[PDB]
Amino acid sequence: PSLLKKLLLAPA
Amino acid sequence: MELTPDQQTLLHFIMDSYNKQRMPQEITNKILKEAFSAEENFLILTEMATNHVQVLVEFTKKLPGFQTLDHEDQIALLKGSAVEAMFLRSAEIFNKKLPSGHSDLLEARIRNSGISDEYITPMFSFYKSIGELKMTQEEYALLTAIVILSPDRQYIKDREAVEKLQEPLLDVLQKLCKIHQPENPQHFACLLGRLTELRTFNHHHAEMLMSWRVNKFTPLLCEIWDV
Ligand SMILES: COc1ccc(N(CC(=O)NC(C(C)C)C(C)C)S(=O)(=O)c2ccc(C)cc2)cc1OC
């Protein structure tokens, strides 16, 4: 996965 | 005139998330306290842009209904709006968050670093232009959300779902315009008009970034900007 996807999908 | 309870929830979410994080004072302080030639200008640009990416990803994630979009559409809106949302956030910091007179000093240092002024002059001119509209924190945060939730993007599969997400935000912004600038019925259209200038920065962002390269962007920045 891309860096953006990892950051976007990281649970809040 | 007054925001209904549903509109208040949308506005609370946007305002809480927008003002949660702040650009570290020490990043901007390096410009005046340390040597600032083309190389340092490039490194500081990278740190600031990285800060924008970290803030805007967090902000975007808290946008009302953003998680109703599939992951590919979420990524497309993020990448599609990145440059515009970054300049809007920088405009707010530059115009309202710096100590008195510091904006002119920071402009001075950038104009004297050595980096080509091809895209620098229109950036500062944009800040001056939006600065004359005397926007509130609410207006900056809502315009940022409106930019992100744009159904017009090259890449967005569910345009109608995005249009339905953006519509209540435009409605909140229109209400805020009527409450605080009642004497100017075109205030809402003026705010939105400033987004056409941002779209041109977005369209030519690869050439702009090229002009700021000193003889190299980080992996995260290469991803969000397609460079
Ligand atoms: C070429 O020099 C720069 C170009 C853009 C930026 N920036 C804008 C800016 O308005 N910064 C100001 C602060 C107060 C927020 C000051 C420093 C002027 S920025 O925030 O690093 C930025 C904005 C937008 C994009 C697409 C990339 C990078 C910063 C730069 O120097 C470090």
Entry summary:
Chain A is mostly helical and 12 residues long. Chain A is 58% helix and 0% strand. Chain B has one domain: Orthogonal Bundle (Retinoid X Receptor), CATH 1.10.565.10.
Features of the shown structure:
heterodimer; A: 12 residues; mainly alpha; 1 helix; B: 227 residues; Retinoid X Receptor; 11 helices; 71% helix; 0% strand; globular; binds the ligand COc1ccc(N(CC(=O)NC(C(C)C)C(C)C)S(=O)(=O)c2ccc(C)cc2)cc1OC; transcription; D3R; FXR; Docking
Your description of this structure?
It is classed as transcription. The complex is a heterodimer of chains A (12) and B (227). With 12 residues, chain A is mostly helical. Helix content of chain A is 58%, strand content 0%. The longest helix of chain A is centred in the middle third of the chain and has 7 residues. Chain B has a single domain, classed as Retinoid X Receptor. Chain B is built from eleven helices and no strands. The relative contact order of chain B is 0.16. The interface between A and B is small, with 8 and 13 residues. The site of the ligand COc1ccc(N(CC(=O)NC(C(C)C)C(C)C)S(=O)(=O)c2ccc(C)cc2)cc1OC has 18 residues of chain B, from helix 3, helix 4 and helix 5.
What's the helical proportion of residues of chain A? 55-70%
The class by helix and strand makeup of chain B works out as mainly alpha
Beginning-to-end CA distance, first to last residue of chain A: 18 Å
Q: Categorize the overall geometry of chain A.
A: elongated
Q: Report the CATH architecture of chain B.
A: Orthogonal Bundle
**Which sheet architecture does the biggest sheet of chain A show?**
none
- Which structural class do the helices and strands of chain A define? mainly alpha
> What is the string of SSEs of chain A from the N terminus onward?
H
So what's the CATH class of chain B?
A: Mainly Alpha
Query: Care to count the β-strands of chain B?
Result: 0
- List the chains of the largest interface with their residue counts: A-B, 8 and 13 residues
Percent of residues of chain A in beta strands?
under 5%
Helix-strand string of chain B:
HHHHHHHHHHH
What's the alpha carbon Rg of chain A, rounded to whole Å? 6 Å
CATH superfamily of chain B: Retinoid X Receptor
Number of strands of chain A: 0
